[PDB]
Amino acid sequence: DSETDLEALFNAVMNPKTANVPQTVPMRLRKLPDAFFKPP
Amino acid sequence: GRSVASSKLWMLEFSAFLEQQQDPDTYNKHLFVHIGQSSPSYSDPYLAAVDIRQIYDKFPEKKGGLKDLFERGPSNAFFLVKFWADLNTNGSSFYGVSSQYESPENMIITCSTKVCSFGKQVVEKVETEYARYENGHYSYRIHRSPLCEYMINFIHKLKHLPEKYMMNSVLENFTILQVVTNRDTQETLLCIAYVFEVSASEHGAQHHIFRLVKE
Ligand SMILES: *C(=O)CCCCCCCCCCCCC
Predict the structure, then answer these.
(1) What is the residue with the minimal CA distance to atom 9 of ligand 1?
(2) What kind and span of H or E run contains B111?
(3) Considering only alpha carbons, which residue of chain B is nearest residue A27?
(4) Changing residue 154 to A does what (chain B)?
(5) For B1-215, which CATH class?
(6) Number of Cβ pairs closer than 8 Å across A and B?
(7) Chain B: which residues have CB within 8 Å of chain A?
(8) What residues does B133 pair with on adjacent strands?
(9) Which CATH number fits domain A1-37: 6.20.430.10, 2.30.110.10, 3.40.605.10, 3.40.50.150?
(10) Cα separation of B178 and B159, whole Å?
(11) R_g of chain B, CA atoms, integer Å
(12) A39·B157 Cβ contact <8 A
């Protein structure tokens, strides 16, 4: 595999059943300011 | 609007755009993201802090990576920009990026831009810029730098996604690291970490700028 595979990146969201990418913590779950998620 | 400045360098302008030529005398420009466009650029320490440890995973590690750069300092050169990108657009196309900087010092600067996926470097674009004297300061301009093919491909793939939550899902693992350096001294003049979402609002592209701190 390759983490930088562009096709795999988009396949992960288009076809979740065949997703083959690193598993990550969503930004909204992190210790970040409210302004990070609410546009001005 | 709000911009980005250390003790030695201020980024007044930053924009990524698609320019379409209808005919030899007619051009349409779409801005994906912009800093210092809609209103005159300014800089002050009136912006919030982000714990840099919360974002190390999204950027290159090891020597020369974000942690290494941050630890070497200076601390006041490090920023996080959150963009809400405007994707509502689209032989005669030009994808470009433009930026402008000001410094009290006459330097030769290098601007490195690294595009990353899952915190791993995909591509790097490196540009060398010389100073021009302007109204009691030195100005540096990267004018209409062509967007790399990876980025053009990425934008095309984003727009072919049927749902916006899918675009945001992809974007959570897409980042850009910009490091502006004094070529000779290797001092970090500006280091800007870019994070992205898709804009939904009617006015278009938006941004928020944060200081990166150690905590
Ligand atoms: C060289 O190619 C790197 C130039 C820096 C890229 C500018 C940012 C591109 C933003 C386009 C919007 C698509 C991401 C949501």
Answers:
(1) B16
(2) strand B108-117
(3) B172
(4) Reduced transforming ability
(5) mainly beta
(6) 62
(7) 48, 50-51, 54, 57, 82, 84, 117-118, 120-122, 150, 153-154, 157, 161, 166, 169-170, 172-174, 195, 199, 201, 206-208, 210
(8) B138
(9) 6.20.430.10
(10) 24
(11) 17
(12) no
Structure tokens at B41: 């650029």
Whole-angstrom distance, CA of residue B12 vs CA of residue B43: 8
Q: How far is A18 from chain B (nearest CA, A)?
A: 15
C-beta separation of B35 from B206 below 8 A = no
Q: What residue ranges do the domains of chain B occupy?
A: 1-215
B166 alpha-carbon distance from chain centroid: 23
**What is the Cα–Cα distance from A34 to A14, expressed in whole angstroms?**
29
The angstrom resolution of this structure is 1.6
Torsion B29-B33-B36-B38 (CA) sign:
positive
Nearest to B181 by CA among B104, B143, B116, B127: B127
3-state secondary structure of B115: strand
Buried b (16+ CB within 10 A) or exposed e, B34-66: bbbbeeebebeeebeebbbebbbbbbbeeeebb
Distance B146 CA to ligand 1 centre (A): 10
DSSP B147-169: PPHHHHHHHHHHHT-S-HHHHHH
How many CA atoms, within 13 angstroms, populate the side-chain half-sphere of residue B9? 29
